[PDB]
């Protein structure tokens, strides 16, 4: 390849931010969480 040297990318600033948003919210990112079809309409507390 052009760069066969594979390197993990832990340095993702948005990732821990959006993950934190995902944790501190009922994660309503239209992302199938778990058993989440009609469980949360306005979200949890």
């Amino acid at each position: 390849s052009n760069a066969d040297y594979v390197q993990p990318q832990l340095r993702r600033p948005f990732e821990l931010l959006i993950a934190a948003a995902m944790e501190r919210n009922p994660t309503q990112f239209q992302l199938p969480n778990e058993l989440t079809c009609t469980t949360a309409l306005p979200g949890s507390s």
């Binding site: 832990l10 600033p13 948005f14 959006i18 993950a19 934190a20 948003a21 990112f29």
Partner: protein, 94 residues
């Protein structure tokens, strides 16, 4: 043999936790503002997903600059929140 990274991102993640909490506390009472920002993240995650779906060769329509400018236009009056936000993309880092 580990090599799986035992030291994850702790401080910036904990800062993010507090920041998201701070976002709520900052504009507590105005859902539209916080939701709009949340949709920004939602949109970027979508774009990032779509980009990496093509391996990463395909660039998304939402750029970091775009995002930040949207956030700055999103949260007005209180720049203190944006000041906190600056740590999630510090100009000092290349």
């Amino acid at each position: 043999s580990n090599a799986s990274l035992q030291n994850n991102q702790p401080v910036e993640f904990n800062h993010a936790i507090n920041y998201v909490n701070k976002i709520k506390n900052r504009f507590q009472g105005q859902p539209d503002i916080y939701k709009a920002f949340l949709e920004i993240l939602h949109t970027y995650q979508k774009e990032q997903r779509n980009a990496k779906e093509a391996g990463g060769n395909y660039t998304p329509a939402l750029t970091e600059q775009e995002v930040y400018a949207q956030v700055a236009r999103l949260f007005k009056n209180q720049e203190d929140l944006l000041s906190e936000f600056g740590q999630f993309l510090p100009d000092a880092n290349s």
